[PDB]
Design goal:
The structure is cut from a larger assembly and holds chains A (257 residues), B (173 residues), C (355 residues), D (294 residues), E (87 residues) and F (362 residues). Chain C has 355 residues and is an alpha/beta fold. The termini of chain C are far apart. Chain C has helices at 2-9, 104-112, 114-118, 144-155, 174-188, 215-228, 270-281, 293-298, 304-314, 317-320, 328-339; strands spanning 21-29, 33-36, 42-45, 61-65, 71-74, 88-89, 133-136, 159-163, 193-197, 238-242, 261-263. Chain C has a six-stranded mixed β-sheet with strand order 6-8-9-10-7-11, covered by helices on one side. A five-stranded antiparallel β-sheet of chain C has the order 3-2-1-4-5, with no helix packed on it. In chain C, helix 5 packs parallel to helix 6 and helix 9 packs across helix 11. Chain D is of the alpha/beta class. Chain D is built from twelve helices and eight strands. The longest helix of chain D has 16 residues, at 52-67. The longest helix of chain F has 18 residues, at 315-332. In chain F, the strands form two sheets. A five-stranded antiparallel β-sheet of chain F has the order 3-2-1-4-5, with no helix packed on it. Chain F has helices at residues 2-6, 8-19, 22-26, 114-129, 132-137, 155-166, 185-199, 226-238, 281-291, 303-309, 315-332, 339-353; strands at residues 32-39, 43-47, 54-57, 72-74, 84-85, 145-148, 171-174, 204-208, 249-253, 272-275. In chain F, a hairpin with a 3-residue loop joins strand 1 (32-39) and strand 2. Chain F is built from twelve helices and ten strands. The chains are: A alpha/beta (257), B mainly alpha (173), C alpha/beta (355), D alpha/beta (294), E alpha+beta (87), F alpha/beta (362). The A-E interface holds A 80, 128-130, 134, 138, 150, 152-155, 157, 186-187, 189-191, 195-199, 202-203, 205-206, 233, 236-237 and E 1, 28-29, 31-32, 34, 36-37, 39-44, 46-47, 50-52, 73, 76-78. Chain F: ATP binds at residues 149-156. Chain F: It is found in: Cytoplasm; Nucleus. Chain F: There is a cross-link at residues 160, 181, 216 (Glycyl lysine isopeptide (Lys-Gly) (interchain with G-Cter in ubiquitin)). Chain F: Belongs to the AAA ATPase family.
């Protein structure tokens, strides 16, 4: 186990195949199928778990802890509780429905099981840009006092090609270890999902993000302990397929005029 | 391309930048539907920032040639970029007599043709339309087998299609 | 069978490392050569063993070794476009004698195109300039494209047929590169012929205030005019502009200096339409003693497209009308059929001269 | 050997000798950009109340010849191609098309308007007809387009760009499917509001032989909906089913479904497992305000 | 994001914008005409001047010809606070 | 024994000795790529899907005529040399080409139109089935026929029965697919339609029901007025600028051809024009017997009585009543359709399916 030592490569697990054998995908973009080290175990890892690999042979080394560094949120809140929720008035009608779909399921999860109502996993906020959102998410995150992840919608794309789909996965993996986690996406209307016709043939950047956004929602969150909040502008900037049941059923519009 | 054009223009000071058909790039880009913006003005912003930026000091100058002034960006005309706006209308009467004589220096004639007479037979013709008359005058002598271009070659060329003259049939009644 | 002979010489051309060269375009020439790869990587190199110092030019693809970069063999530039390779045809079926009529639409084209190519020293005595471009529009249905192929047969050189919709690509700005693809072969291949078809979809100013998506097409001509007559008068071959709508074109494109000879097709008269049936009389089946001048006289003025339809449909009456060959009676039935019967609507001829 | 290997099969490739090692898995069911393939949905006839009158019509037209192909063959007639319905907005017809593939063991496949025009070399126009061919590969299933329609959310309420183009195209492509096995059984179910939006060529016979009008839900129609669609959970039977239906004015199948979501939202504030008529009264007044707004 | 890296380092800094009609565009979906990186660049101004990053020590001076071409959401308060009229 | 030793023995010996060299050549991972251009010096340039740039020579197992820009070749791993050309198998790329598995729709079902049926057969099926008639005559065969008439006259089934007996390649294209959303892809599609169809067999290009570029009402795929001139004139150049030996036939049909640009027709290529009208009482008796041939009818149903009740009906309206009468008997599960089903069928067709035209005169 200690032959590997310092020169290690960061890998990612994909799917189990054979006993003590698994497929891995490193940050270099080249996927390899190697054998699992005897000191490791298939039950001690996760399908999305990141692992270590050798420099040349790229053999499996060790299972990293369920903490993904990546970028953006990294660890967690830093100096966030600078304000309270009383600084924004008139939204008490709108903020009441937000606390029920965000703060309520993160406290008592048996209220939805006994009553038998499926709490919305995703949250979209409509309305003209520059009215709501903004300080609202900060007020909810400060009153909850739990894990909070704010990832900008335009930051998912990286200069490297295959880094796009891996940065999206690392955001949801941070919500796996910490149950009271809130994932916020600022300006989700940039990449959106497929963005109507994205001309995928000429640009692959969308297909890598398109597959992950649909897979991460259905693949995770079954425990209903993690909620997703996205910040958009209007409905014409998003794919209406998101409103289909099974992924995101929630619709919130700003009370304009 | 334009950004590096002024970068190399700073190395050699006595340089002159020429732009052909300025109407190719310009617009305010409005009265449309959503996307389709900046399909033009991406390059125009280079001419805005560079000419008003560190460039255009002493010997750095840009001469922008275009077709018509009806369609362009009024923001392009400024005392910091294009100063002199000069109209170049059609040639005058006696001016066309000197133009026709210059294009004939490579031809062969008897020098018996009055050039002031051919200029008076031409009313408001383009400069290229003047040189095009000498082209047809040479083709007429080839069909008739003449060893030199005579007076009737330029006269028959006007009757043919050159400038504002088109006839597919005699049609006299 | 041919693979056995090539395996003998394949020892030096395979085992050894020669061909595995990385091709890239050279940028700066210091007489150190700065060359940028296809992966966007810049490096410095120099000449080779058999490489000549005068062969390397600015803006040329130069293959270099992948391990230790060095100049080995030069390559012709502009290797990216694959589109213009299929635009060149060979041996068109339409001959020079296929164009009927004694009128002036024949002799005027051969003197400004075929004459300087066959006898370049004829006009050199007078010291004149042969017309670079020509003008052929005419009404739809006169077989204008047939006259363009008749010139390529007598020329016996490279012919290029360009579709007006081919210049417009699926990206904005790619059409500008499509223009230089045509003029690059003019300097590479001398004494060739280029032909544009349906330029109305391209030309015209169309200004600004319209739908707003029209600014992409108007830049194709501004790229085409620049490549034709620019700051540097670079040109060799003849350029042919053709379309069915001369009125919708650019009023600058309709003025000389890019074009000198201007020929517009017209409908043949009683003497003209007679030769249309004479060139078709050698074909099909013509009964002895039939005068074709009476058939073209009963037919009104119409384009050559409807004139050739008389001889084609005349053979169709040999089945239903119970006839052996085409007789005079079947010709009179074609007058009320090929002409009078097919008028109705959707018949162009002279209908649309403008828009 | 090569007999056990076919296309779209993920295998292993050795790094040293560069040869075949083993077989990993096959290709996933979803393909291209967006692929919706669902077999045996959860929508049934007992889960949709009040439409039984319209269920018997689509059962003897769509469902009947699919399960018994020997009927129309003995009668000498041909199976109708398309079926389209129209009515007020907020239709519950989505569950009707899902219930057809349930009993017929077919699949439920939707075509997205963005799947028609994409970026490909030579396949750009194929993607319009690709999902028509892809639906033929696995099962007859159902061709159902709900994607492009005017409920008021999108502009140009008179027509659409990607609506009449794909709907009219797939009707004329059945000539190849006509006469070939497991093909002609494929039908097309459409949806719309007004008949003036469609082209006059669609109103002519030979393409859509049956046009069923969808009436708006009435008081008696919402009675069976309130006891099925409105209750997904454990509730009290003390409330009146016909009294709540009278309080809802102009509520379609979509507005009544929203009552189920808001039925317990007012109970979440007090955190109680008992849901009385106090919450249902506040749910009806909340839905009616969103309908009258704008 | 490379520009705002110096904002947190040197506090007395001001970002000049000279004749910029571009990055404040609109362009939602016509098919996007391959704007994929530009649409994110438009959103970059909707993040640094919006989210929890420290502000107030770095002033944004933006200059444009016609504000109607720019995104109306960018002109609203919360990003550009002061509109200076230069008649 | 003697003959096999001087023929099969020397040939099989050279084949076994040759394949021993194929291991060092056709072995290895065998990367592929796209051919760029060739040269008389036997060299080419190939770009793999990883987008490299390589310039190598031309090896065996390939011909100079087989090399074309835009094709697929086979490279080498170590030496990176072209092994040979790889032809595209499993159909010519796009499979929606309507290869016509031939359901065999005969002329007996379209019967009653025989006055206008023999019109298209002589200008389409006759030169394909009996080419010696036009070749020995000397006239050039027409490239197709244009169809015009009211909906329901059987213009769709007329061209379907022609391609059945010819046993050749035939295409069916919807007129609404000529225009796409992206600008410039409209004329690019029309180039690939006639290119692939002309390479394999004397095919026929049939585009039915052309609404292209009129009454737009299209928000998504509308390209303005520039898509109008590029897409339409691209089809005109395929019948003019595109050279062909006469094996490509183009037949266009729709409800109204007046909205289309008449310059696109160019009737020097198409010398045949077929119109359509409503059938009389004598023709409807033959059409009614076609649909009722396989249908089981009762003894109280008269064929001449149903035709007499028909007023201002087309060929599609006759089948509509035969289909509606079959659905009524299907609900009650009756083998022989009674007379009561035809009474309720004619009332539903004349009400909804049959709408009064806007002609209105008289």
């Amino acid at each position: 186990k200690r032959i590997q030592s310092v020169p290690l490569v960061i890998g990612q697990f994909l799917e189990p195949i054979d006993q003590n054998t698994g497929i891995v995908s490193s940050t270099t973009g080249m996927s390899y199928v190697v054998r699992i080290l005897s000191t490791l175990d298939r039950e001690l890892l996760k399908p999305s778990m990141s692992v270590a690999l050798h420099r040349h042979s790229n053999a499996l080394v060790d299972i990293l802890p369920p903490d993904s560094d990546s970028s953006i949120s990294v660890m967690g809140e830093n100096e966030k509780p600078d304000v309270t929720y009383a600084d924004v008035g008139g939204l008490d009608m709108q903020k009441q429905e937000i606390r029920e779909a965000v703060e309520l399921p993160l406290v008592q999860a048996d209220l939805y099981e006994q009553i038998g109502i499926d709490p919305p996993r995703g949250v979209l906020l409509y309305g003209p840009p520059g009215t709501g959102k903004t300080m609202l998410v900060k007020a909810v995150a400060n009153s909850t006092k739990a894990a909070f992840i704010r990832v900008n919608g335009s930051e998912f794309v990286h200069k490297y090609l295959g880094e796009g789909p891996r940065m999206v996965r690392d955001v949801f993996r941070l919500a796996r270890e910490n149950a009271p986690s809130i994932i916020f996406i600022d300006e989700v209307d940039s990449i959106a999902t497929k963005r109507f016709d994205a001309q995928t043939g000429s640009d692959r950047e969308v297909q890598r993000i398109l597959i992950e956004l649909l897979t991460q929602m259905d693949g995770f969150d079954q425990s209903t302990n993690v909620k997703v909040i996205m910040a958009t502008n209007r409905a014409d900037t998003l794919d209406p397929a998101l409103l289909r049941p099974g992924r995101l059923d929630r619709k919130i519009e700003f009370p304009s005029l | 391309l334009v950004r590096d054009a002024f970068a190399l223009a700073k190395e050699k000071a006595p340089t002159i930048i020429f732009i052909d058909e300025l109407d190719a790039i310009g617009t305010k880009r409005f009265d449309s539907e959503k996307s389709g913006d900046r399909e033009v003005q991406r390059t125009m912003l280079e001419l805005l920032n560079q000419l008003d930026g560190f460039s255009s000091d002493d010997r750095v100058k840009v001469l922008a040639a275009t077709n018509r002034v009806d369609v362009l960006d009024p923001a392009l005309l400024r005392s910091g970029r294009l100063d002199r706006k000069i109209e170049f209308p059609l040639p005058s009467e006696d001016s066309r007599a000197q133009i026709l004589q210059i294009h004939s220096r490579k031809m062969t004639t008897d020098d018996d043709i009055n050039w002031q007479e051919l200029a008076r037979s031409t009313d408001e013709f383009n400069g290229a339309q003047l040189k095009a008359v000498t082209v047809e005058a040479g083709m007429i002598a080839l069909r008739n087998g003449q060893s030199s271009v005579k007076h009737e070659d330029f006269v028959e060329g006007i009757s043919e299609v050159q400038a504002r003259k088109s006839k597919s049939v005699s049609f006299y009644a | 069978a041919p693979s056995h002979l090539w395996d003998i010489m394949g020892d030096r051309q395979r085992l050894g490392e020669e061909h595995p060269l990385q091709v890239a375009r050279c940028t700066k020439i210091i007489k150190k050569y700065v060359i940028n790869l296809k992966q966007i990587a810049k490096f410095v190199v120099g000449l080779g063993e058999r490489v000549s110092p005068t062969d390397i030019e600015e803006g040329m693809r130069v293959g270099v070794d992948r391990s230790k970069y060095n100049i080995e063999l030069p390559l012709p530039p502009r290797i990216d476009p694959s589109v213009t390779m299929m635009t060149v045809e060979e041996k068109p079926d339409v001959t020079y004698s296929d164009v009927g009529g004694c009128k002036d639409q024949i002799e005027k084209l051969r003197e400004v195109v075929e004459l300087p190519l066959l006898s370049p020293e004829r006009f050199a005595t007078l010291g004149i300039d042969p017309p670079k471009g020509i003008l052929l529009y005419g009404p739809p249905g006169t077989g204008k494209t047939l006259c363009a192929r008749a010139v390529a047969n007598r020329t016996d050189a490279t012919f290029i047929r360009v579709i007006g919709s081919e210049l417009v690509q699926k990206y904005v700005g790619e059409g500008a590169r499509m223009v230089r693809e045509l003029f690059e072969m003019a300097r590479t291949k001398k004494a060739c012929i280029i032909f544009f078809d349906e330029i109305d979809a391209v030309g015209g100013a169309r200004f600004d205030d319209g739908a707003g998506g029209d600014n992409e097409v108007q830049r194709t001509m501004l790229e085409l005019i620049t490549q034709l007559d620019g700051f540097d008068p670079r040109g060799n071959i003849k350029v042919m502009f053709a379309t069915n709508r001369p009125n919708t074109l650019d009023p600058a494109l309709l003025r000389p200096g890019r074009i000198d000879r201007k020929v517009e097709f017209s409908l043949p008269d009683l003497e003209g339409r007679a030769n249309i049936f004479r060139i078709h009389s050698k074909s099909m089946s013509v009964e002895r003693g039939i005068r074709w001048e009476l058939i073209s006289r009963l037919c009104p003025n119409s384009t050559g497209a409807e004139l050739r339809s008389v001889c084609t449909e005349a053979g169709m009456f040999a089945i239903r009308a119970r006839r052996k060959v085409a007789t005079e009676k079947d010709f009179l039935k074609a007058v009320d059929k090929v002409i009078s019967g097919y008028k109705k609507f959707s018949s162009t001829s002279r209908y649309m001269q403008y828009n | 050997n090569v007999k056990d290997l076919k296309a779209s099969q993920r295998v292993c490739l050795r790094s040293d000798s560069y040869m075949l090692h083993k077989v990993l898995e096959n290709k996933a069911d979803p393909l291209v950009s967006l692929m919706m393939v669902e077999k045996v949905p959860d929508s049934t006839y007992d889960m949709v109340g009040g439409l039984t009158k319209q269920i018997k019509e689509i059962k003897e037209v769509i469902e009947l010849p699919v399960k018994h192909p020997e009927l129309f063959e003995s009668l000498g007639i041909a199976q109708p191609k398309g079926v389209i319905l129209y009515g007020p907005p907020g239709t519950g017809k989505t569950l009707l098309a899902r219930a057809v593939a349930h009993h017929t063991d077919c699949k439920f496949i939707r075509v997205s308007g963005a799947e028609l025009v994409q970026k490909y070399i030579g396949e750009g126009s194929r993607m319009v007809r690709e999902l028509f061919v892809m639906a033929r590969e696995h099962a007859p299933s159902i061709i159902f387009m709900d994607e492009i329609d005017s409920i008021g959310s999108t502009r140009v309420e008179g027509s659409g760009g990607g609506d009449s183009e794909v709907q009219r195209t797939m009707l004329e492509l059945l000539n190849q499917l006509d006469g070939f096995e497991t093909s002609k059984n494929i039908k097309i179910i459409m949806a719309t509001n007004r008949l003036d939006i469609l082209d006059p060529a669609l109103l002519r016979p030979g393409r859509i032989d049956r046009k069923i009008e969808f009436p708006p839900p009435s008081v008696a129609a919402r009675a069976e909906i309130l006891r099925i669609h409105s209750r997904k959970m454990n509730l009290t039977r003390g409330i009146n089913l016909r009294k709540v239906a009278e309080k809802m004015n102009g509520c379609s199948g979509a507005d009544v479904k929203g009552v189920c979501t808001e039925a317990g939202m007012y109970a979440l504030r007090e955190r109680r497992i008992h849901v009385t008529q106090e919450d249902f009264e506040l749910a009806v007044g909340k839905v009616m305000n969103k309908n009258q707004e704008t | 994001r490379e520009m705002f890296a110096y904002a947190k380092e040197h506090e007395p800094c001001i970002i000049f914008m000279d004749e910029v009609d571009a990055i404040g565009g609109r362009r939602f979906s016509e098919g996007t005409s391959a704007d994929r990186e530009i649409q994110r660049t438009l959103m970059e101004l909707l993040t640094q001047m919006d989210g929890f990053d420290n502000l107030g020590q770095t002033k944004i001076i933006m200059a444009t010809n016609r504000p109607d071409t720019l995104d109306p959401a960018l002109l609203r308060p919360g990003r550009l606070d002061r509109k200076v009229e230069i008649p | 024994f003697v003959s096999n030793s001087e023929i099969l023995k020397p040939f099989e010996k050279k084949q076994e000795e040759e394949k021993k060299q194929l291991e060092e050549i056709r072995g290895n991972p065998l990367s592929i790529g796209t051919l760029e251009e060739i040269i008389d010096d036997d060299h080419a340039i190939v770009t793999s899907p990883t987008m490299p740039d390589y310039y190598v020579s031309i090896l065996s197992f390939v011909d100079k005529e087989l090399l074309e820009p835009g094709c697929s070749v086979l490279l080498h791993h170590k030496t990176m040399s072209i092994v040979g050309v790889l032809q595209d198998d499993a159909d010519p790329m796009v499979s929606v080409m309507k290869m016509d598995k031939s359901p065999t729709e005969s002329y007996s079902d379209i019967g009653g139109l025989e006055s206008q049926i023999q019109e298209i057969k002589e200008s389409v099926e006759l030169p394909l089935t009996h080419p010696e008639l036009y070749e020995e005559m000397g006239i050039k065969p027409p490239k197709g026929v244009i169809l015009y008439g009211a909906p329901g006259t059987g213009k769709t089934l007329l061209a379907k029965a022609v391609a059945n007996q010819t046993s050749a390649t035939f295409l069916r294209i919807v007129g609404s697919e000529l225009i796409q959303k992206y600008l410039g892809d409209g004329p690019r599609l029309c180039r690939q339609i006639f290119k692939v169809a002309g390479e394999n067999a004397p095919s026929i290009v049939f585009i039915d029901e052309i609404d292209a570029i009129g009454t737009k009402r299209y928000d998504s795929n509308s390209g303005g007025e520039r898509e109008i001139q590029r897409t339409m004139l691209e089809l005109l150049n395929q019948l003019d600028g595109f050279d062909d030996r006469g094996d490509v036939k183009v037949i266009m049909a729709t409800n109204k051809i007046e909205t289309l640009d008449p310059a696109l027709i160019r009737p020097g290529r198409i010398d045949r024009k077929i119109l359509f009208e409503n059938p009389d009482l004598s023709t409807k008796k033959k059409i009614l017997g076609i649909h009722t041939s396989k249908m089981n009818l009762s003894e109280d149903v008269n064929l001449e009585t149903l035709v007499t009740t028909k007023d201002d009906l087309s060929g599609a309206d006759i089948q509509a009543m035969c289909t509606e009468a079959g659905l009524l008997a299907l609900r009650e599960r009756r083998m022989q359709v009674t007379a009561e089903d035809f009474k309720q069928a004619k009332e539903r067709v004349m009400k909804n399916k049959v709408e009064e035209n806007l002609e209105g005169l008289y």
